[PDB]
């Protein structure tokens, strides 16, 4: 009735009462249909004995009982009856045969990049979602922005968008509709602004991951904003703390940002000359670490589009050659080459080729830059004093300043493109779009995943918290009496053990401070804090015929694995404030503007943990709206997904937890009428007076409400 | 599955697995235990120190032998010995091979039975043995016949074996060693 105004998308959005009419009464039996395990489905329905084209016989407490034909066609998985793995798995893979790409999850909006163009987005005939809820209408994310809509101009609160990408496509679509739909609702868009210049960020922020060919690096958080009566207004783009460690270390079939590599084709010998440089990567080691190309994508092309957006940005011929200046110096530092001084402890140099190029380029000295390097000076009370130095740490300088070079060019072109991007009259509200990598569960597991899945649990616990707050909300709504331990903080608080000053990267720092400190003696020191009084806290299990950790920690996404060679060359930076001034100073005049504005402690931990919580404080004065891309096969074919790659993504997806945590519900809430109506075989008072546990429900206000594993048997 | 090796002794721990050539780790049999101060706040103070990393540590470590003339005289210290044989040294997990210890003769019975005790409780062998170290030494030496004389770092004795017939009457014993040599040195 009110879908059939959606017509050829109808289908789509949701089936005419037919099919499902005959679907709700499918003859299915509770006691002969199970789930077991498999090698390459690992969830199969089932007849202990059981067969379904391959028999086994397991125990009869891992079998999972398929859910009820009543509602095997369901986009919202909160309202079935037995809440497990297999269950959610087949129930997506059913409606996304039949083709329904999207899904409701309690509070999710779980999505499928479908490979096939389909007119469920195009044109407005389905785009009329207009004034409507998310609970009535076929589940679109275009009312999930509709609902955002309303609700940031109800409460004149801002709105969070949250959407995980680290898969490869479906995050790039999704963000290009949604934002489509926003330009649509409050009328060269401000989307082709966007898409513009994109492609800075794709060469800055993007390499080739192991598990990857274009993975963003940093996190996304597109401000869009909104009149004061809720007219669209100019957009900037906010962005956040970015895997710079990148910049100088590299495992083993991986590479740091494109830019490197676009330029190094070759394809613009101005560049090759300008900045002295060769065309072969194994010559300049912050680069060569691991592959020097992938042949899944081409250069010179990269180069040309970054070339194309450059042009289309503000950017002169000094903002286009003094950032390739500043790209062609960080990969000159690279090679720069020193010796302890004969006799004694102090670097001195052995060739200065690569001090003549970089000092020429950024407009330094290279007497000036070799000394400020060898020769570091302090503020001392009211004095100078060198500093002594050996070859190590001047090195650790190298790398720091390198680091910090990138990481402000990168910010100043993010507020250079903001700027490009801004023409617009006084506004007051928008929406927040987050876009940030996901988990990351590989089979070598190293600092930088140690990192990541630190950020993705702190946006776990803060979905959590909102989720918990939002479903004590709706418990107190109906007079249902029921309290429970947080769910959104509590279960988490014990595995933030990472950011207590005795955890694991504050012992890191200690270390890091600490004289002769080694992997080994580093490894001593968490055991001795940590081993078993701890809980989250193990030992791996390294079996012969893996690569070996060193320890394992229970996260949400399962248990995770981590091997701590090499961390305090990832973690230490100890910058050089000589140098600094030197860069204030430079000719090269990007230089002075990035660096314009009574030091040897510095740590990648403590940088990384502040921009988190800075983001986390960004949040959390706002209301939250969680998106979930899915991609269902790895050779792109449309139609079917591979069951044991979606599982994993699901686990690391974390609706799961969603699912987990209203296990503990009551998740079925159901209306008095419809349970009074379909269950009537002998208002509600007399009708489950009749019989089970009475704790089953919780009779309040016209709603009953129900634990999972109930409506199996009605 | 194939089975450890582990000849104490009383100056060096020679452990490997039955069928090399050669055993696979000697270190000393020594457990050290820091005497001084200890200034230097989060250097990682480990309570003790065995083998050879105690050797290498013994100028500030005050050292202690827990074998002193083939018999066993402190119990913990050589539970410690045979935890690092087996887990920092050969690297293996003891569950999951037989042992085969060995011990001098006419020594108390006491010490095999806490040998055996050991073994089979606080690390779970499947199986385990004793043998006698002339025994041994005359299998290597690939006869069955002759009078053996054996002299390691704590006790010295002769066995005379025929045809692979042992004179336990003709067996003798006597107590010094290579660390009463080092002593009189």
């Known amino acids: 009735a009110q879908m059939a105004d959606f017509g050829a998308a109808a289908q789509y959005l949701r089936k005419s009462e037919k099919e499902r009419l005959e679907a709700q009464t499918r003859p299915f039996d509770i006691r002969t249909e199970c789930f077991v395990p498999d090698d390459k489905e690992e969830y199969v329905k089932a007849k202990a004995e059981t067969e379904n084209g391959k028999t086994v016989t397991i125990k009869e407490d891992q079998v999972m009982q398929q859910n009820p034909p009543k509602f095997d066609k369901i986009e919202d998985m909160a309202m079935l009856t037995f809440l497990h793995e297999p269950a959610v798995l087949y129930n997506l893979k059913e409606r996304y045969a039949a083709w329904m790409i999207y899904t409701y999850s309690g509070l999710f909006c779980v999505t499928v990049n479908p490979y096939k163009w389909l007119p469920v987005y195009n044109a407005e005939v389905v785009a009329a979602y207009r004034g409507k809820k998310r609970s009535e209408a076929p589940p679109h994310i275009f009312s999930i922005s509709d609902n955002a809509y309303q609700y940031m101009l109800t409460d004149r609160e801002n709105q969070s968008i949250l959407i995980t990408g680290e898969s490869g496509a479906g995050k790039t679509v999704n963000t290009k509709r949604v934002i489509q739909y ?38 996304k958080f597109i401000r869009i904003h909104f009149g004061a009566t809720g007219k669209l207004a100019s957009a900037d783009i906010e962005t956040y703390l970015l895997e710079k460690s990148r910049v100088i270390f590299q495992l083993k079939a991986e590479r740091n940002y494109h830019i490197f590599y676009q330029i190094l084709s070759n394809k613009k010998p101005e560049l090759l000359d300008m900045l002295l440089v060769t065309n072969n990567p194994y010559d300049y080691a912050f680069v060569s670490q691991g592959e020097v190309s992938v042949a899944s994508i081409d250069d010179s092309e990269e180069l040309l589009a970054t070339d194309s957006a450059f042009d289309v940005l503000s950017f002169t011929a000094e903002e286009k050659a003094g950032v390739y200046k500043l790209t062609g110096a960080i990969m000159h530092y690279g090679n720069m080459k020193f010796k302890q001084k004969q006799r004694e402890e102090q670097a001195e140099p052995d060739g200065t080729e690569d001090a003549d190029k970089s000092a020429y380029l950024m407009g330094l000295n290279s007497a000036d830059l070799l000394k400020g390097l060898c020769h570091p000076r302090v503020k001392v009370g009211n004095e100078y004093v060198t500093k002594g130095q050996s070859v ?31 023409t617009k009259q006084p506004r007051q509200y928008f929406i927040g779009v987050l876009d940030i990598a996901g988990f990351e569960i590989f089979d070598f597991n190293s600092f930088e995943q ?15 918290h909102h989720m918990f707050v939002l ?19 509590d279960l988490q608080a014990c595995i933030d053990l990472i950011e207590k000053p005795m955890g694991i990267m504050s012992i890191l720092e200690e270390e890091c401070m600490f004289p002769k400190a080694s992997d080994m003696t580093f490894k001593a020191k968490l055991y001795d804090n940590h081993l078993g009084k701890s809980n989250n806290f193990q030992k791996p299990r390294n079996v012969k015929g893996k690569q070996e950790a060193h320890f394992s920690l229970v996260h949400y996404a399962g248990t995770v694995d981590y091997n701590i060679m090499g961390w305090l060359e990832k973690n230490k930076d100890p910058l050089n404030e000589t140098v600094v001034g030197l860069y204030q100073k430079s000719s090269l005049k990007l230089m002075a503007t990035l660096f314009s504005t009574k030091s040897s402690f510095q740590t990648v931990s403590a940088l990384h943990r502040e921009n988190l919580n800075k983001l986390m404080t960004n949040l959390k004065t706002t209301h939250p709206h969680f998106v979930r891309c899915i991609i269902p096969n790895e050779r792109k074919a449309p139609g079917v997904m591979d069951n044991p790659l979606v599982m994993h993504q699901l686990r690391c997806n974390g609706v799961l937890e969603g699912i987990r945590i209203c296990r503990k519900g009551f998740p079925n809430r159901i209306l008095y009428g419809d349970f009074r109506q379909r269950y009537r075989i002998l208002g509600a008072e007399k009708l489950l007076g009749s019989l089970i546990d009475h704790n089953q429900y919780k009779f309040g206000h016209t709603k009953v409400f129900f634990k999972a594993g109930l409506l199996g048997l009605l | ?75 913990d210290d050589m539970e410690k010995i045979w935890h690092h044989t087996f887990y920092n040294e050969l690297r293996v997990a003891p569950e999951e091979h037989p042992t085969l210890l060995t011990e001098a003769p006419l020594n108390p019975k006491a ?39 054996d002299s390691g770092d704590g006790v010295t004795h002769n066995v005379p074996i025929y045809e692979g017939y042992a004179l336990p009457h003709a067996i003798m014993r006597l107590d010094l060693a290579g660390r009463d040599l080092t002593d009189y040195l």
């Open chain 1, 182 to 219: 926003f330009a649509s609702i409050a009328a060269g868009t401000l989307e082709d602004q966007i898409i513009q210049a994109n492609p800075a960020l794709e060469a800055f922020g993007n390499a080739k991951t192991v598990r990857n060919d274009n993975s963003s690096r940093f996190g």
């Open chain 1, 392 to 422: 190590q740490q001047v090195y650790y300088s190298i790398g720091a300043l390198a680091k910090s070079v990138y990481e402000k060019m990168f910010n100043w072109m993010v507020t250079r493109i903001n700027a490009t991007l801004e």
């Open chain 1, 450 to 464: 140690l990192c990541i899945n630190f950020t993705n649990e702190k946006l776990q616990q803060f979905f959590n």
């Open chain 1, 471 to 489: 479903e004590q909300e709706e418990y107190k709504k109906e007079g249902i009496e029921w309290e429970f331990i947080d769910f959104g903080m």
């Open chain 2, 1 to 75: 599955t194939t089975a450890l090796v582990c000849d104490n002794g009383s100056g060096l721990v020679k452990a490997g697995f039955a069928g090399d050539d050669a055993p696979r780790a000697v270190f000393p049999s020594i457990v050290g235990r820091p005497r001084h101060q200890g200034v230097m706040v989060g250097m990682g103070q480990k309570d003790s120190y065995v083998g050879d990393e105690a050797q290498s540590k013994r100028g500030i470590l005050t050292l202690k032998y827990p074998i002193e003339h083939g018999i066993i005289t402190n119990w």
């Open chain 2, 111 to 149: 010490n095999r039975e806490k040998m055996t005790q050991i073994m089979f409780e606080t690390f779970n062998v499947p199986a385990m043995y004793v043998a006698i170290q002339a025994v041994l030494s005359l299998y290597a030496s690939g006869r069955t016949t002759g009078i053996v004389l």
